[PDB]
Design a protein around this ligand. Structure first.
Ligand SMILES: NC(=O)c1ccc[n+]([C@@H]2O[C@H](COP(=O)([O-])OP(=O)(O)OC[C@H]3O[C@@H](n4cnc5c(N)ncnc54)[C@H](O)[C@@H]3O)[C@@H](O)[C@H]2O)c1
Ligand SMILES: NC(=O)c1ccc[n+]([C@@H]2O[C@H](COP(=O)([O-])OP(=O)(O)OC[C@H]3O[C@@H](n4cnc5c(N)ncnc54)[C@H](O)[C@@H]3O)[C@@H](O)[C@H]2O)c1
Ligand SMILES: NC(=O)c1ccc[n+]([C@@H]2O[C@H](COP(=O)([O-])OP(=O)(O)OC[C@H]3O[C@@H](n4cnc5c(N)ncnc54)[C@H](O)[C@@H]3O)[C@@H](O)[C@H]2O)c1
Ligand SMILES: NC(=O)c1ccc[n+]([C@@H]2O[C@H](COP(=O)([O-])OP(=O)(O)OC[C@H]3O[C@@H](n4cnc5c(N)ncnc54)[C@H](O)[C@@H]3O)[C@@H](O)[C@H]2O)c1
Lengths: 22, 338, 338, 338, 338, 22, 22, 22
């Protein structure tokens, strides 16, 4: 994992990570 | 007695849901008793009362102290823990969690609420994995009372699925393509900024932004006959709420636009009353703010080519209409509780 | 020698066209010598130089006096008469009028320029009635040099027709439906206000606004095989420029998304070079400002169901790309002048 | 006997005014019996009912025929003539014209309504020339029932003048500067386009657009002691309604922010009740949609330097709040009608 | 030897700064060799190239791999750690960190970069505490090369301070109030959502949003004579870039609008050349995208009352103009580096 | 014709009348 | 006097002419 | 001290926490 991939696993609600299936 | 509800994630859907319930609580089997959110009660109460889309909440007084928010004297306990396993669901006697954070959509994630003491979870989004999915008006009567984690699908699925069901039963859908021209949502960045999705990274109020969507494929979860037969995309545009689905279907029984409209109108008056509204008016997105239907067919836009290629267009208030359906599903679970 | 051009209507298209020509004038057979518009030279020069969408014009100095505007020393005579029959086309030796007002789109209306002394009129819009219609890259080589009034179709037709031609020749289009998610244009009101079209009446930057469109049917003018086989609608959204067409076709030869993309990519490199661009990048509308292609296929969005139901999505800069095509058509007429 | 009212110009102010009156009809001394506008009754009825800013009109049914619009079965006759001298004011027995077109703001222009038979004209805008000007809550008790043409000033003057009156009486205003950060209005173009004012020419929803304004100087008409002591500017920004005044004054009596706020709070509870509202809440522009006050002081923004340089900031709903004041002025004229 | 630069925080300012340096690279004493940001190199390269405000980067090819981004084949190493104490500054030989995250603005926070091995830190924001603060063109010649942490102030302070310096030296500023009508920035939410600041919580593209600001008080750091004599506020509005300062000052020497304009014009041609631009044109915010000045005086808006109350209005590109100043300050530090 | 229909025939470029086929 | 000036005198409500004193 | 206050101390760049002094 990259640091970015790990960050989104730990903080899926972070602004860089949110995916809402509209 | 009353099913005790906690909202996890007091965001656009969490707060729209709360307002839906506050307006409907006289006939409810639900009591909202708790909120978990990143922020504190003061912030929760402020944003519940003052809403850029809904306006100032009119029906009851909204206040807060250090521990709770209050809506017309009804006290709602508040907590702030981003790890659901730590939440006080046992202590608060929570029966049902409304999972509206956007981040606990798998069974593993949503089950953290069960470990904390809740009995059931209703995810306000498509589930990831093997989670029973319901669209009120389409398949909610199939609810199995033994289920502990359910999904209310997405706003777009709630708009599209009722229309698809009506068209399928009347004409037989063989294949269909969808595009939703959708208001921007909180997963997009305000100005260009880091995002694992390079299109969601881009300034939302400045751009038309394509995103993939599972909404068309998810219609196949609630209408199993149509599994694998639908696909589509989303275009996010610079409006803050209200969306429109454009659906182009290949149907078995040849038809014309007048007959497509007649079938949908008849359903809107009978089998789909309260779910589909049929409009012959020349309106625009703002006029559908606060509409309670899942789908408003814009009848003037229906067209058919060659008998079998059918285009229909339907509006939806993606915040408020969807939240009305979340409440409908929660009430259905409360009335079939085990 | 040079074909002497007047612009009638110095609006978004008239001014984009002028800027296109100023950048391309070294290889041009056209000389822009006159402008007619509701406003005066000072206003014309100011708006040509300062553009909210294009930025400040970089290539040459733009000034004005009481009689003319000046672009890098080139003097352009100005007049202000809303009745074209009174225009000084004989006195100015005008050969070709670029009809960009939006209001002289019938042969009767456009012919007023001929009465005033011009030899030909190029309407920057669909014609009303029996007016030969061209899309560069699709049927412009069929130009009959004896024609006196021609139409360059609409922005949406210029985006859709090249893609349709490629798909038709590869797979055979039997029927097709289109929706353009389109930037707002100057026919819509800024705030809700009187309009003979009740949807165009509504606040343009606040709403998704459906409008009927002739763009899909007009593809049948430039690809005569497809007359009567296409239909569609427009959804105007709160962006000021750049649009996207979503096209769902029923095709004869069964295919898959990878093959659809391969065919369009090959055309973009050969027969449609400069007209269709093929993009595999995850971009958004702002990134297509100033693109010179008529159609930019967003390859990531292509999908096919059941072999015969094909969805493709293409971007277009409706102001700048369309104006590049107006200039291309005008240059073609100048090179085939009679 | 009711005062018979005709609305000239059924635009944002004309229609906001109509809705204000329909809600306040039971207590009214006015009867709206006629509308003149560029458009027809069916368009007027549609726009009265469906409003992008106010929502769908809830209180009564709105319908139309060839000759009239109906609000709760009450008929309002319609005509369409851009020359007021031709209007049927004597034939309809019109007492008061609400002049809301934006174009008859001089005595010569407004007097065309008197020639057509109306008894009085209330201009919903600053007057040009020697037209008596009123701000309700500041000087409306100086209204003379013999006056045949009056002005209700502008939205900005109605926001600023009550605040200025309170500050002047408490501290003595020596000089003052204003900037209104104002929602865009219908005099600006949607996309860059010809305009005799080069800034109003520019795309309204894309830009911060400065304009000169007489609104601050006009406060000297309604507070004659301050004639020549006030000036300011406007910055139009991309919101469709709700505006804010920022006022910086040199005062005679030294003060501090707390005292400035207390003086305005006290006035809002007494002499300025219903005209000034005092807010200590941290709100934003959308929260003031539909507010009935002329001025809402944002107490958190008040600041003072050196005892004598005072800054206050006040919100106003420029469409709805101003239209409430138009109605208040008209009801005052009716109460004093001979 | 080049001064080796790392950018901490590759956001709007970090990426504007990178583009400013890439365009000015031939004359630079700086070499940008590293980036730390929350995201990965491929995302950073994509956002550097494709910018909703600046357009597609034209001057050099931008690519990326797992470890670096490349601009014209020149490698910039990338890392992703939100704790600056862990950053590889000694390992990369970093001389100067451009601290552009918004979160390390105190001496304790910025010093974490020194602990990690960097020699100096330039904070792209007001400092908290005892951090020397510079505005290029106002006090940057007071920079002491022994200082290890400096602040370049805010965009608003960089716009206001040059104007204040010129007005103070010409007329003697006694007190002054400011309002910035400012484009929205990335600290505001896209839709109403939790925030510790209740106004930043609100939908940024839908509202006029007041915020407190230290920008006016900060002018007293760079013009010490005016410590405590200036204050102001911010109103965030729905434009994505370009802002305007409105400044109202009490001055000692009586003056008139013409003299105020002439003094600023003279400074813009001499002592403030490149920092203040003087404009007599009637432009709007979009026209100032990419302007290199810190302040563009809009001469048409200048007004004076009673000799001593002066209003001036100045535009600024808050992203690009400010980033030009960050680069100017960094080049100044490099020119004086021991 | 209504007065509105006549007005749009006489002034097809007026704000109340423009129809651009996008 | 120019044609544009006459146009705005004759049609002060035209889109090229409106001046609302906000 | 509240949980929200601790969250913003630990994550000042989080969307619920950012304060840019414009
Ligand atoms: N907005 C719509 O139109 C819409 C419609 C249907 C479904 N949905 C779905 O509903 C969900 C929420 O969407 P939204 O628009 O309300 O988003 P939002 O960002 O407005 O709200 C999310 C809320 O959850 C909070 N939160 C995030 N992580 C948390 C955690 N670990 N613990 C506690 N609280 C947390 C956030 O602070 C925020 O208040 C998403 O799954 C979305 O796809 C949205
Ligand atoms: N904007 C687009 O995306 C686009 C794309 C393709 C085609 N078009 C078509 O081009 C035409 C113009 O569109 P636009 O966007 O440039 O509109 P616009 O409103 O910006 O420009 C029209 C111009 O013509 C002037 N005008 C109007 N009536 C006139 C008359 N009688 N005499 C002289 N001048 C007159 C107006 O003052 C204005 O300057 C329309 O037919 C439109 O459908 C527009
Ligand atoms: N919108 C605001 O915030 C606001 C606030 C205070 C005052 N005002 C003032 O009110 C006036 C109207 O503003 P608005 O915002 O309602 O503008 P608008 O453009 O929405 O309305 C003007 C209406 O008058 C009609 N009209 C124009 N000329 C006419 C004529 N000769 N005969 C009949 N009808 C005609 C137009 O078709 C339109 O329906 C202006 O003077 C404006 O400055 C506006
Ligand atoms: N945007 C403007 O107009 C402007 C003007 C002048 C100054 N500023 C200041 O510049 C700073 C940044 O503003 P911006 O507009 O670029 O904001 P931004 O949100 O676009 O950029 C901040 C960047 O820093 C990253 N980041 C956040 N925390 C981090 C950490 N701990 N480690 C590494 N990276 C981290 C973010 O992911 C983002 O890429 C703020 O202090 C702001 O006040 C902004």
């Amino acid at each position: 994992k990259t640091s970015f991939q790990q960050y989104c696993d730990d903080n899926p609600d972070a602004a860089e990570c949110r995916i809402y299936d509209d | 007695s009353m099913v005790r509800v906690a909202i996890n994630g007091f965001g656009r859907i969490g707060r729209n849901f709360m307002r839906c319930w506050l307006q409907r609580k006289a006939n409810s089997k639900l009591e909202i008793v708790g909120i978990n959110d990143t922020s504190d009660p003061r912030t929760n109460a402020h944003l519940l009362k003052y809403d850029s889309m809904l306006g100032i909440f009119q029906d009851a007084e909204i206040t807060a102290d250090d521990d709770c928010i209050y809506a017309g004297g009804h006290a709602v306990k508040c907590v702030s823990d981003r790890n659901p396993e730590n939440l006080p669901w046992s202590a608060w006697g929570i029966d049902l969690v409304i999972e509206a954070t956007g981040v606990f959509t798998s069974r593993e994630g949503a089950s953290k609420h069960l470990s904390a003491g809740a009995k059931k979870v209703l995810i306000t989004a498509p589930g990831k994995g093997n989670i029973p999915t319901y669209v009120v008006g389409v398949n909610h009567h199939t609810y199995d009372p033994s289920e502990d984690i359910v999904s209310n699908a997405s706003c777009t699925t709630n708009c599209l699925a009722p229309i698809v069901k009506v068209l399928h039963e009347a004409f037989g859908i063989q294949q269909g393509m969808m595009t939703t021209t959708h208001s921007y949502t909180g997963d997009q960045r305000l100005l260009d900024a880091s995002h694992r999705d390079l299109r969601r990274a881009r300034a939302a109020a400045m751009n038309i932004v394509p995103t993939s969507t599972g909404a068309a494929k998810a219609v196949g979860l609630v209408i199993p006959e149509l599994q694998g037969k639908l696909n589509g995309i989303a275009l996010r545009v610079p409006t803050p709420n209200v969306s429109v689905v454009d659906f182009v279907a290949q149907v078995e029984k040849p038809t014309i636009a007048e007959q497509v409209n007649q079938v949908i109108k008849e359903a809107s008056e009978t089998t789909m009353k309260g779910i589909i509204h049929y409009s012959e008016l020349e309106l625009v997105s703002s006029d559908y703010r606060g509409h309670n239907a899942s789908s408003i067919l814009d009848a003037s836009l229906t067209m058919v080519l060659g008998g079998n290629l059918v285009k229909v267009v339907a509006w939806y208030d993606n915040e408020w209409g969807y939240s009305q359906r979340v409440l409908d599903l929660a009430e259905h679970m409360a009335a079939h509780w085990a």
